[PDB]
Symmetry: D2
Subunit: 283 residues, 4 copies
């Protein structure tokens, strides 16, 4: 599988979206799993999930790696509401356009917020819910905020450079030997290709600060079986939020990887794939 061979586009129409272009990468043909990426500069579906798509397809799933609005090859957008909710509306728009009745959701960071909002707003349209360090869930009981990683994410948005990108990735990943030229070049290309996305994210962040993303109070509504993952060494979203989710969602479990930053599905891809495939099959 390659980004090119799996690349697709679909126009969506959903509350506040009109003929809005969504890019996604699709492979496989069984039960649908939609994977939702984080909010870092240059993020997108393929970039975030290319170590996961193959094994999930091998296990018999139809995998859709979705580009959220204002990311990668999806249309540019300025959001005046919290991104989790607006992103979730876009997932519903995609599913309606593709005639997908229910999807399992996998979401990291901003994508975790997207998945939580989708589960809240459209409970009859979700299967299982998989969350990797979801962002925007209010204060930490231990971590000063904004977190170290978030400071770097904003610096990279406001002053993009290859060096600042490298700096960000060094904090993003636990194992520094994972930061290859290929990784750097790929994220840099996506940043260089879509400068308007960077500008628009910043405008959106001023309109709807991170506090507006906090759906903690509604977590008791979630009936989906939920699998929460965290990197022990995540400098972007606080580990104690894994406990917050575990205590507030009815049917959840929490899996924390040692020696793992803010990109668990990539840093610990083999274990992540096995655990999540097992969860989707058997839970």
């Amino acid at each position: 599988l390659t980004e090119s061979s799996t690349s697709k586009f679909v126009k969506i129409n959903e509350k506040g979206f009109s003929d809005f272009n969504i890019h996604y990468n699709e492979a496989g043909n069984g039960e649908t799993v939609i994977m939702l990426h984080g909010g870092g500069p240059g993020a997108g579906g393929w970039s975030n999930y290319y170590r996961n798509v193959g094994p999930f397809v091998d296990a018999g799933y139809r995998v859709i790696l979705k580009d959220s609005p204002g990311f990668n090859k999806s249309d540019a957008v300025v959001m005046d509401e919290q991104r989790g909710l607006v992103n979730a509306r876009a997932v519903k728009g995609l599913m309606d356009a593709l005639d997908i009745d229910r999807a399992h959701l996998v979401g990291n960071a901003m994508g975790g917020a997207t998945a939580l909002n989708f589960a809240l707003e459209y409970p009859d349209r979700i299967g299982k819910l998989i969350l990797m360090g979801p962002g925007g869930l209010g204060p930490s009981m231990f971590a000063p905020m904004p977190m170290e990683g978030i400071k770097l994410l904003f610096k990279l948005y406001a002053e993009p450079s290859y060096e600042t990108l490298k700096q960000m990735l060094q904090v993003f990943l636990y194992d520094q030997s994972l930061i290859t030229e290929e990784l750097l070049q790929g994220r840099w290309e996506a940043i260089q290709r879509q400068p308007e996305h960077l500008k628009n994210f910043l405008i959106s962040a001023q309109k709807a600060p991170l506090s507006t993303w906090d759906v903690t109070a509604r977590l008791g509504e979630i009936k989906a079986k939920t699998f929460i993952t965290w990197g022990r060494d995540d400098r972007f979203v606080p580990l104690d939020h894994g406990l917050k989710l575990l205590w507030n969602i009815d049917d959840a479990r929490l899996h924390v990887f040692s020696k793992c930053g803010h990109w668990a599905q990539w840093e610990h891809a083999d274990e992540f794939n096995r655990l999540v495939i097992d969860f989707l099959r058997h839970a």
Copy 2:
């Protein structure tokens, strides 16, 4: 499989053990997994693990459910040293007697302490290490100690009764509907059958308080791949010790079950079996 058809005895000889009788339940014939029980009145291998033995044997493992010294059908003993270490010596004695070169260890509560001590003392004799709420790892950062459950464990040891047993099990288990007459009757029989074990545990506890079991300082020595499990709702061993292990053991992961007391392998048997079998196969 039944307790009767799997029941075996072996005399061990190891530092401080001379012709000492160890009872165990064995099934299967592949790689050896030794499962080690907690320190509650009436505990034993079969009692603690009967929801796990079958699936592990089905997966191709040789499973040994070991009765630790001073429990169930193993010989009575008064220990002047911390139980984790003395128990670990008994595991080594068993393996030597049965010509087992290396074993994967699974241990809950006191059994987790046993497994940690074994990994520390005999690193060339362990495969993988699976820990379910290990006991004796020093103070909690959040929980007043002794924990609620430990108070009840001591009350049951000093004044055994069916009612106190029921009280203990209500705190031990999250889901009260799991407390059947069968469970109560089985633990009660083991308590009634071996009064000397109760008396001896109490004498041992005075000689070597829980503080003596704390091997925290040596956790960096552990090279075994480690899978740590905790019940979110464990009132016997504090959840933050799961983090202590995760931060201090080189290669660990932490899995926490929601709606789960101090007996995770039984309360969440299906998920526990799948996760741990996957870990032994693939990690």
Copy 3:
């Protein structure tokens, strides 16, 4: 000062209170500090605060030790709403009746909930806010709930006895040598004297469970300078809620006493008095 010489009664009239009798103990004549007690069987103003009233009066404050509705010598009541809010309405009723424009509030456990609700509902009527282990603030990130102490509080409410009272106090206090016959006899007298209060608390708890007391979402509204106290060894309200308050209230500080249960103002009276008087004088 004695309970008898300071005892006073006042009828209040405030939303849902009509000619409702409130008992309080008053001493001193400077700035008013209203101290609000917890929800344990037999609790009341004098009982909870008799180690604090003298030093506060000596420091120049007018101290009012208030009996909340459905406690001690205040009128009996069944509440269909969360007690923090209803109690706060009663504090406002008291202050209006006594022509008190603004009061500093000190509240432990249920009294902490009362004080938080009062600060939220009547921000122009509060000076400073002092909180000792406030109850009802949602789930803990670490403690299984209901907490050990809360189980005992309900057992004592439903089946009051001197022995169960003693059991409760042993968990309530860290230092067992503080549990004198005088303490036991005093709480027992208050329990024996007002059986209707016990029955009514239980009815109220069914109508408005602890979840309804959770005002976490509104903590950002609090503009009062706030001093939060916790017992390190509090088995009734979880220590991590001290952090929750510290992170969510604009201007707060947190002081945790070692070797201290759920009654910090009594167990560590000298240090508590010095700290809180200093806070009221200088913060």
Copy 4:
């Protein structure tokens, strides 16, 4: 009081110190309080404590603001052992030279480590112990390490510049409006004046990593009454270590300031002075 009018030097002789020059600032003449600074580039006694010296002297204490070896105007040194212990030896050397039998100790960050080591090694030479975010106490249960602030401290040591200094101070302090030109210029002067100190700290850090400073296992030996302070927003030493100390030292209390970085005695000077003076007077 000024740095100039209080400046003094004394040669010390103590295990591994021979005719070693220690600079300190002294004022007042009552009971001795020795204040011990952190390990940041350009740190020293006066710099760290100039908002505290006056009020403590006013309260009747003799205050000694000590420059630790390899800082400010004390002699240069390369340490092959953990700095807490070596620093503590230097405090003993100072006290012996000045005929001080017992001192109260106040220590932030590295200075907190110094104070803990002194209490451990010389228990008959300490009065009370005051700790502000002591460094080197092993892993955090929540914070990825090295902490954000520590990364910046090392960057400033290895590549000193005014800009990197400003960057460091922005993370060091919660309230950005506290970062005046005066503060920046003062720390910069101390960095420019003693380049050898920067080089030597780095050499020392390679010889004795932060893990070697961890005296956690010995905290039970401390008999001094202890007051622990933390900034809620400390990005240099993890808040949960405040709990570690509170649970492990016999007689401790913990005070956490909101809106406070890694320099609590300066950021919240008025409250810090009142609390600590009260503690020394009355505890």
